[PDB]
Amino acid sequence: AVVKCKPTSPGRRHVVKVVNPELHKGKPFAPLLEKNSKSGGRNNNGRITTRHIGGGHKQAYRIVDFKRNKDGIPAVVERLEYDPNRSANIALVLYKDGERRYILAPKGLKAGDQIQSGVDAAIKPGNTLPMRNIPVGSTVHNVEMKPGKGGQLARSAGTYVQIVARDGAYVTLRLRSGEMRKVEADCRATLGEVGNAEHMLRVLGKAGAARWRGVRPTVRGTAMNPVDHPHGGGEGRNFGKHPVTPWGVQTKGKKTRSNKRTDKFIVRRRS
Template structure:
């Protein structure tokens, strides 16, 4: 008994106490994140090991000492470069909330309602004005997962909304950077080199973007606004230009490859706030601040509210799992097949996103 007690005393002297290691706020800097942009994939690069959901870099997240249950599991990305002031009033609009109801008063989006009062940031997804714009600051946008950048035109004649704009910030964008829009075409000036146009944040027609370039904010019509690849950390890649000069092939984040008109435009780089997907809400009240109400299970409802509801047990009985509207769920295809499907399928989809076994094996 004496030997066991002495061994415990010796181990307590050698091993450091966990209370000495833990800090009040575990916070690290992001200086290790180099501002490098990979616009092309090197063909000779080695295959990197696939990251799993458990591989989380704790150097870019802020955690808290569990002095209350609401912050025990709270985890936020560290963004020291975000501007902490108010947005530009000229570039915002008031938001009137409807609680997920349409003009007839019917619920179209379930479990929505409440939330903190906010103003809508007016983002320029078209960017038709040419010329250079200076990045003034990077701001937080409560209406989207990505960060936004406030840019100012260098043209002295520009005024109002043509001088000040909000755009989606690319990964690594900081105040002092310069972005430019070549949506109307690249000028014939010899001083405008290709390396100068292929910079993160610049807008180019897809025909002018080299194969392998990482892009985002992809439009689907020559004069339309950006519709694809706009959420935090997402990106697409130009994989092929057809010889006919009409379409280009773009690989989306899901693995789907689809045709896009070469006259459409896209922005170089990847969308900012890459670590947004690794955050943890921490408590139910924080979801209420974001405008989300509790998501109720179907088996917990009455029979009139859901096909799985009712009964004296806590089971859906011998029914196939369906949604609240009676549609088959858990793997039921809701999208029409691709090029090998019926005549009314989406002809622009060359290869559908991997599913099932194909997805688990890496899409090979």
């Protein structure tokens, strides 16, 4: 649930936690773990490519199965777990053959719910089938963009896709951004919505709370000595120029989609 703390100190007035006792109070399944090194926004060249990244708490990577290629084998949920590498939570499932794996947590999954993947799977949350067999107007998540590679859409806290039509080997989708995209009619998509919806209602409350996540402070630019930014300086707060990124781009309306490759699955991009 969501709980609002008390103002016992400056830094706890506006803090709002998202407590979920369903999560496991113990160590996760190690066989499915893998080191995850922090970069700091730097690349092989050692230069900062993405700013506002650095520090944070150590993390271990949870190997999640977005493909769900184990068809015709039921799996029961053992326990929910906290995943720092992502917003949503995961669920450790056990397959009848003796296999254990991680998956994203749908809206109302618990410990003991049974699920199955494939074409003959049941139409209920948690199960995975290609969008060819899914009905129209339903709600799914962890959608695949190309058959066989794994889910890439609707992977966040409370994201969900709504199948609106199916013409042929393609199927139309309305993503959480309002974009009306269509994908092949064989990409595997899980039923239901990812359940952490109360995550957006969270409030960090203090600065150090953002540093734990690994986000470094953001310096605006208006007070940045124009040698370092177009906005630069000025005697006071002048800012008598158009809003502009570094390297000279608008940042307040300029569309920067320069792909021109697909331009076919896009139908009602947005607006």
